[PDB]
Amino acid sequence: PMEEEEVETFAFQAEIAQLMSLIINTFYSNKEIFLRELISNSSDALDKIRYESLTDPSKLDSGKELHINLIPNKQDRTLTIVDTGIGMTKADLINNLGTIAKSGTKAFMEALQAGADISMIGQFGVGFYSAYLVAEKVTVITKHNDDEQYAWESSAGGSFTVRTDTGEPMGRGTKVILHLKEDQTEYLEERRIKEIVKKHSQFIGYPITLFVEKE
Ligand SMILES: CC(=O)c1ccc(NC(=O)c2cn[nH]c2-c2cc(Cl)c(O)cc2O)cc1
């Protein structure tokens, strides 16, 4: 029987859209820092569930294990980063990942057009958008306690969508799926992933596991 699914389409806040075009359409060396930003975001969300569980242990009913998995797929050309952090409500996605102005956006674009290296992005509070250095499309699947699982998606161009996710259930957390650009397939290679995690994400306070499919 035919299933029906509600979708909502949103416009990025004007300077966020400007930042995304600047990230996509300008050449930057040091694109590898996208992964540091993703891991640091997962780490922050894991911190939130960890401390929030000291008050209310039943917040870990949706899974006790606090960790980060990296999953390259050479046939899909995707790299997926999964955490079991606190997750995002529907309103969190809509607000935190596109519609609400971020106070650091302008400063960052100014710094970057004066020659700052792209690695500075995290300090400006817009580090998520570094995903578009390497990815043509980003999907963020998320599950927060007491809310449904949602899917956010954007290929930039000024909009994003949000929908209730009817895919594979997660207990709690956030899964980011990077559909990589054709010239950025190095970030599917075991050695390269291990290299940049070692260089940039060495002191993360949760275990990270890299899952590699048999060649
Ligand atoms: C705009 C920006 O850079 C940004 C960075 C991180 C967040 N994180 C969250 O809101 C959050 C809350 N729970 N889980 C997350 C989360 C978000 C992202 Cl984008 C991620 O990659 C991993 C997460 O755990 C939101 C915005």
Polypeptide structure, described:
- The chain has 5 helices and 8 strands, in the order E-H-H-E-E-H-H-E-E-E-E-H-E.
- The protein has 215 residues and is of the alpha+beta class.
- It has a single domain (1-215), classed as Histidine kinase-like ATPase, C-terminal domain (Heat Shock Protein 90).
- The protein has helices at residues 14-25, 33-55, 90-99, 105-113, 190-200, and strands at 8-11, 68-73, 78-83, 135-143, 150-154, 159-164, 173-180, 208-210.
- The longest helix is centred in the N-terminal third of the chain and has 23 residues, at 33-55.
- It starts with 7 loop residues before the first strand and ends in a 5-residue tail after the last strand.
- The ligand CC(=O)c1ccc(NC(=O)c2cn[nH]c2-c2cc(Cl)c(O)cc2O)cc1 binds at residues 38, 41-42, 45, 83, 85-88, 92, 96-97, 126-128, 140, 174, 176.
List cofactors, ions and other ligands. ligand 2D7
The main pleated sheet reads as: 8 strands, mixed
**How do the helices and strands follow one another from N- to C-terminus?**
EHHEEHHEEEEHE
CATH class, named Alpha Beta
CATH architecture: 2-Layer Sandwich
- The percent of residues in helical segments reads 25-40%
Strand order of the largest sheet: 1-6-5-4-7-3-2-8
Distance between the termini: 38 Å
By secondary-structure content and strand pairing, the structural class works out as: alpha+beta
The number of strands is 8
**Rounded to an integer, what's the Rg over CA atoms?**
17 Å
The fourth-level CATH homologous superfamily is Histidine kinase-like ATPase, C-terminal domain
Main location: nucleus
Binding site for ATP: 41, 83, 102, 128
Modified residues (N6-acetyllysine): 48, 74
Region (Interaction with NR3C1): 1-215
